[PDB]
Amino acid sequence: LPPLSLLDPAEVKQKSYSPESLEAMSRLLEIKLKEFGVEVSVDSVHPGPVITRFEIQPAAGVKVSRISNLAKDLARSLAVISVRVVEVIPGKTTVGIEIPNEDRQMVRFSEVLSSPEYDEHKSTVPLALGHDIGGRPIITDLAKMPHLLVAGTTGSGKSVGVNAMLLSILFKSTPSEARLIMIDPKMLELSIYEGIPHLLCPVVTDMKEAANALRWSVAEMERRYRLMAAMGVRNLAGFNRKVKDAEEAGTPLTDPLLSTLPTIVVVVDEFADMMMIVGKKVEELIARIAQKARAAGIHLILATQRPSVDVITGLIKANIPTRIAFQVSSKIDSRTILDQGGAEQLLGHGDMLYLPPGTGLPIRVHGAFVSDDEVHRVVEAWKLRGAPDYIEDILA
Amino acid sequence: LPPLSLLDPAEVKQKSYSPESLEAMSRLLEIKLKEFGVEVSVDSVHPGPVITRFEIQPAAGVKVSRISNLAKDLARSLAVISVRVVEVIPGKTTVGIEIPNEDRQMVRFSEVLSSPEYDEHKSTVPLALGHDIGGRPIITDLAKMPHLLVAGTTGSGKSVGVNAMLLSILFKSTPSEARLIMIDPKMLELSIYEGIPHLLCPVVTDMKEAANALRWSVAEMERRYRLMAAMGVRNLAGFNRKVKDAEEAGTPLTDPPQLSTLPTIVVVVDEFADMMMIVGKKVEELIARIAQKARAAGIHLILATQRPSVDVITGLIKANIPTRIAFQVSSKIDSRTILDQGGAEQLLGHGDMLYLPPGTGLPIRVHGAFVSDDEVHRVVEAWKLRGAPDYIEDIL
Numbered sequence: 001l002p003p004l005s006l007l008d009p010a011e012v013k014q015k016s017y018s019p020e021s022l023e024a025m026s027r028l029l030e031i032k033l034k035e036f037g038v039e040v041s042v043d044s045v046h047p048g049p050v051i052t053r054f055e056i057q058p059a060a061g062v063k064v065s066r067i068s069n070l071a072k073d074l075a076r077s078l079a080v081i082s083v084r085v086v087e088v089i090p091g092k093t094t095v096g097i098e099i100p101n102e103d104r105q106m107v108r109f110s111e112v113l114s115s116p117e118y119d120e121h122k123s124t125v126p127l128a129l130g131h132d133i134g135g136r137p138i139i140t141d142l143a144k145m146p147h148l149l150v151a152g153t154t155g156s157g158k159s160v161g162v163n164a165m166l167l168s169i170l171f172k173s174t175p176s177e178a179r180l181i182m183i184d185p186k187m188l189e190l191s192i193y194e195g196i197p198h199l200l201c202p203v204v205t206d207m208k209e210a211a212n213a214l215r216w217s218v219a220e221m222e223r224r225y226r227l228m229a230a231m232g233v234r235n236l237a238g239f240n241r242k243v244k245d246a247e248e249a250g251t252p253l254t255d256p257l258l259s260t261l262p263t264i265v266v267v268v269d270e271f272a273d274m275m276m277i278v279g280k281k282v283e284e285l286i287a288r289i290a291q292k293a294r295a296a297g298i299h300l301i302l303a304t305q306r307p308s309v310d311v312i313t314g315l316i317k318a319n320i321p322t323r324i325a326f327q328v329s330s331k332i333d334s335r336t337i338l339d340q341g342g343a344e345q346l347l348g349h350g351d352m353l354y355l356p357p358g359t360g361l362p363i364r365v366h367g368a369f370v371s372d373d374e375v376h377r378v379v380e381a382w383k384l385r386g387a388p389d390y391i392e393d394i395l396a
Numbered sequence: 397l398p399p400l401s402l403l404d405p406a407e408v409k410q411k412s413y414s415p416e417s418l419e420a421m422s423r424l425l426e427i428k429l430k431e432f433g434v435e436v437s438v439d440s441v442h443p444g445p446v447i448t449r450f451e452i453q454p455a456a457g458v459k460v461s462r463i464s465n466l467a468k469d470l471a472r473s474l475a476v477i478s479v480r481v482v483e484v485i486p487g488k489t490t491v492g493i494e495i496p497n498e499d500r501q502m503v504r505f506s507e508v509l510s511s512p513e514y515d516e517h518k519s520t521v522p523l524a525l526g527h528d529i530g531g532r533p534i535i536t537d538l539a540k541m542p543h544l545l546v547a548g549t550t551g552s553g554k555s556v557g558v559n560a561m562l563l564s565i566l567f568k569s570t571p572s573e574a575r576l577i578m579i580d581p582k583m584l585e586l587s588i589y590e591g592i593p594h595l596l597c598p599v600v601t602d603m604k605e606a607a608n609a610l611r612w613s614v615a616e617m618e619r620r621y622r623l624m625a626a627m628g629v630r631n632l633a634g635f636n637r638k639v640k641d642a643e644e645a646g647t648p649l650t651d652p653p654q655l656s657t658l659p660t661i662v663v664v665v666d667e668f669a670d671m672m673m674i675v676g677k678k679v680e681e682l683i684a685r686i687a688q689k690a691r692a693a694g695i696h697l698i699l700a701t702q703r704p705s706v707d708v709i710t711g712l713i714k715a716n717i718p719t720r721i722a723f724q725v726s727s728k729i730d731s732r733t734i735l736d737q738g739g740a741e742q743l744l745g746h747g748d749m750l751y752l753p754p755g756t757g758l759p760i761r762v763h764g765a766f767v768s769d770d771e772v773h774r775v776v777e778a779w780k781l782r783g784a785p786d787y788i789e790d791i792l
């Protein structure tokens with residue numbers, strides 16, 4: 001297995017911004033808000049890698065919308081590009097205002113994978129995304145999402161995000177226990193994984209070839225539910241426990257009407273292009289994959305460039321609860337993906353909002369930068385250990 | 397019939413919500429509303445297991461929209477997550493403001509079934525929802541509803557409420573008295589119920605099989621209307637009363653092959669958004685033609701979703717189904733979708749619903765009684781040790 005020390009080293013960071021600078025910026029924010037109608041008092045300061053949260057306590061009689069509806073001018077008067085107003089902090093009584101820095105301390109991916117969370121993560125398909133607003137890494141299980149929407153306009157750090165997710169897959173699991181399927185309509189980025197041993201098909205450039213791939217995925221989900229009903233265990237983890245215990249206790253169980261089945265991960269670079277070229281049947285197949293495949297071990301990474309009702313329909317939203325929103329156009333597309341506002345106030349360059357599975361406030365996550373050096377190194381490191389193991393029934 | 401003591405006991409309550417803390421919270425509410433435009437004195441305090449109703453008397457000439465248009469800010473300036481404003485209390489001049497407590501008391505299901513109303517309940521299909529905002533247990537007959545909708549986003553406590561309803565069916569009804577048909581398009585929850593004699597069909601996964609099960613329900617409703625028109629008796633319970641009176645006096649009846657006592661079919665459908673996603677509008681017309689006529693035939697529905705959209709809950713569903721359960725939804729739009737009025741977005745999750753009674757009703761706020769998976773396994777095992785399964789080939 002390729003060790004995590006293949007990645008690029010850490011950086012002599014631009015650490016220790018002085019408390020006199022923090023006090024000057026806090027008094028500057030108090031004065032610039034006092035110049036408008038509102039009155040404020042900076043309570044605490046939380047300096048972070050990319051932005052800097054100013055937990056402010058508004059004065060008596062000041063609503064939150066009187067802080068929300070002037071964020072353009074609050075960002076303009078502070079000589080920054082865009083400021084973000086967290087309207088509620090869970091637990092305290094303070095409105096959160098998050099201001100970008102001058103020198104962006106860039107998040108590095110080896111600093112994310114060296115966490116206590118990732119190296120002790122029991123699952124076989126984790127996702128390292130990056131640090132949060134305070135510098136702590138966020139690694140959440142992709143087998144618990146159990147699907148993923150990714151959107152944001154161009155140049156907002158999205159192909160790097162999908163590559164960070166795929167490297168988060170590739171640093172932990174052997175091809176026996178996890179296994180990828182790559183659909184790449186714009187054959188520019190995901191052709192870099194050409195011939196890795198964690199695949200099933202050639203990296204799909206065509207479109208009807210991708211339709212055959214999705215029909216194979218539906219058939220695989222159906223035969224795995226029939227096989228788990230034959231064995232008599234609900235989900236994939238208990239089935240792998242049963243096929244472990246059969247191989248331990250003397251005699252394995254033969255193939256019923258066996259091995260450790262892999263956790264299939266079906267990624268899509270741009271499903272906007274798929275529902276451009278192929279049509280409604282791709283929408284129906286993605287709907288009936290994401291309807292049922294949580295217990296079967298088949299997952300989706302849907303990425304797109306158009307957070308619109310044309311691309312993201314209601315059927316896609318119904319089965320996929322977990323969203324990733326990078327910098328988008330405006331509040332219309334933010335309410336199209338996250339079903340709420342806030343995604344327009346980002347910075348790009350991999351500055352996402354991680355909506356957790358379920359209902360909650362979105363956690364702002366700065367996406368870890370990855371480079372072609374590391375990606376080519378990991379691809380060649382897996383091509384040394386394994387071979388192309390294609391089963392071409394997926395595309396027939 | 398299974399005894400009531402099969403469940404987990406009620407935990408030690410966290411009582412002594414002290415009157416000094418209630419008085420301090422009342423004065424803090426008066427001051428935090430006095431900081432805004434309004435002026436209001438707290439009249440009385442009603443404590444509860446989850447929230448706490450503060451009946452407040454507004455001053456002369458201050459409206460109620462000037463209380464309900466700043467619920468976000470009042471909940472921010474009281475260190476809570478969300479406040480709920482009852483705009484009208486029946487029979488008094490006060491306005492209900494309901495603040496969540498500091499320590500959530502989990503609602504114990506054995507406390508709910510130990511109510512005097514449930515044990516002295518007449519109808520063979522009751523539902524035990526939970527306690528209301530004061531601690532009074534809410535127990536609702538199903539055959540007077542005569543249908544049910546359940547909404548609420550992911551992670552809001554929908555499946556635990558559905559399991560509580562199905563155990564409320566289980567703890568009173570012998571299988572000749574009531575009988576279930578379950579449909580679950582996922583294997584998420586309702587696979588555990590497979591084995592009990594209260595099923596007719598095994599737990600339906602195939603949605604074409606689900607549509608044919610609903611067509612069987614249409615056909616069974618039609619043959620029950622034909623049999624009741626032959627017997628001359630209007631509803632199903634009247635028919636059971638007539639056949640019980642005839643079999644009491646030693647006079648056996650005949651079918652125009654001896655007549656028996658018909659059961660009360662309760663067709664639960666776990667997530668019908670996926671059902672109409674896969675099958676289509678045929679399902680919607682089947683649900684309409686069931687829910688029109690099924691009140692006198694004994695067929696009842698527990699529909700549930702995780703998407704209160706206009707594509708799913710159309711007018712065709714809301715025409716015949718007047719009883720609505722609304723858990724935590726995202727915004728005002730989905731609240732006005734299912735409850736046909738606002739208010740459902742101001743809830744707390746963790747199974748905290750708004751029971752809309754059938755007809756003219758200000759919606760009752762009911763806390764969902766919690767049931768763990770251990771009790772559900774225990775009741776399924778207690779039925780599988782008690783009675784034998786009885787299925788029907790004809791339904792498919």
Ligand SMILES: Nc1ncnc2c1ncn2[C@@H]1O[C@H](COP(=O)(O)OP(=O)(O)O)[C@@H](O)[C@H]1O
Pocket residue numbers: 106107153154155156157158159160161349350366367368369370
């Ligand atoms: N965390 C980051 N730090 C620095 N640069 C980044 C980061 N994330 C992305 N970028 C840069 O932003 C560029 C545009 O992102 P990309 O996903 O290629 O846009 P698109 O979504 O149009 O494909 C990338 O080429 C990458 O170099």
Ligand SMILES: Nc1ncnc2c1ncn2[C@@H]1O[C@H](COP(=O)(O)OP(=O)(O)O)[C@@H](O)[C@H]1O
Pocket residue numbers: 502503549550551552553554555556557702746747763764765766767
């Ligand atoms: N009455 C309750 N009291 C406390 N917690 C509850 C209650 N009902 C549900 N929950 C919590 O909600 C979760 C169940 O939510 P669920 O109905 O599965 O939502 P979904 O079906 O959308 O996933 C459980 O993990 C449980 O902890």
